[PDB]
Design a protein around this ligand. Structure first.
Ligand SMILES: N[C@@H](CCC(=O)N[C@@H](CS)C(=O)NCC(=O)O)C(=O)O
Lengths: 241, 60
């Protein structure tokens, strides 16, 4: 996350860290129930002689605050049993960039670990709304990760604007969030992490999934995120959530 | 071919994963670490330092 600040401890109890064997933190994810995580499809594709689609190759850390303290109280470590990449995912266009991850054993809800709410399929996150991106990703493009979980407040951008800023690259599955001014954005290491949105009763709903961007935090180059409401029924049908 | 595998600049790309990878730098004649986004990378992109060294040994 570029231009963010340290999250408070326990502030984002749905934020998850995914580690691949011998490689440390690769992607974020969100907890949506005791058994299921939402993440990005592009994190879990076979490559360079390593099977990123193979669930045995991953470890999920829940209730994590600091990457150098993964044995702190309340941190829960979990293996994956299943990875479901969306069937329509396209690794050239990044369309349908979403995945469901099944924990080998359920998460235990605590002050540190809790699920995010899922929006109904009909819900719209309105243009201009201040929402939050979180992660341990880079603080600058081509830079370095953050030990302490970062948060950054960003704003929903009109789809028409989004399309014109990134011509021929934005599908209806995608949403621009950030600032036309740049300065605050997600970055490498943040993919698969949730957009968090405070709703009418103060509860937090997932607005989308960190996906891609043209560098990070550049002017007129906001982050591009996978929409959540559109995939509500797909999630229900595959997970029962 | 050594052109692509060893002489090309490293490519982070647009995707926002953080995949620790290795690339050969022909100006230093050494393999160095970089972070790959996960999509549409080029061939100068190795999972292990040892594999990068093997692929690009001696290349100028
Ligand atoms: N119903 C849950 C407790 C409520 C809960 O943790 N719901 C989540 C998902 S709907 C939530 O409100 N998270 C967002 C937030 O706390 O702001 C239970 O009894 O286990």
């Amino acid at each position: 996350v570029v231009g963010g600040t340290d999250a408070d401890e326990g502030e984002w109890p749905w934020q998850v860290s995914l580690h691949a064997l011998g490689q440390g933190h690769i992607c974020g994810a969100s907890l949506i129930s005791p058994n299921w995580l939402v993440s990005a499809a592009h994190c879990y594709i076979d490559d360079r002689g390593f099977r990123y689609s193979d669930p045995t190759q991953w470890t999920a850390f829940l209730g994590l605050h600091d990457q150098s303290q993964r044995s702190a109280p309340g941190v829960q470590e979990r293996r994956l049993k299943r990875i479901i990449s969306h069937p329509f995912f396209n690794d050239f266009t990044f369309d349908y960039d979403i995945a469901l991850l099944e924990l080998e054993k359920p998460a235990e809800y605590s002050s540190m670990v809790r699920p995010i709410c899922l929006p109904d399929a009909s819900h719209v996150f309105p243009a201009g709304k201040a929402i939050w991106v979180t992660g341990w990703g880079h603080t600058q493009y081509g830079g370095t990760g953050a030990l302490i979980l970062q948060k950054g407040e960003i704003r929903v951008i009109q789809q028409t604007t989004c399309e014109n800023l990134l011509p021929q690259q934005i599908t209806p599955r995608m949403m621009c969030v950030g600032f036309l001014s740049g300065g605050v954005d997600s970055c490498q290491g943040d993919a698969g992490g949730p957009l968090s949105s405070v709703e009418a009763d103060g509860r937090i709903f997932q607005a989308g999934v960190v996906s891609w961007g043209d560098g990070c935090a550049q002017r007129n180059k906001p982050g591009v995120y996978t929409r959540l409401p559109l995939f509500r029924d797909w999630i229900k049908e595959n997970t029962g959530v | 071919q050594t052109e692509d595998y060893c002489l090309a600049s490293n490519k982070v790309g647009r995707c926002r994963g953080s995949f620790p990878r290795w690339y050969y730098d022909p100006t230093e004649q050494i393999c160095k670490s970089f972070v790959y986004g996960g999509c549409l990378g080029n061939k100068n992109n190795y999972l292990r330092e040892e594999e990068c060294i093997l692929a690009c040994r001696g290349v100028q």
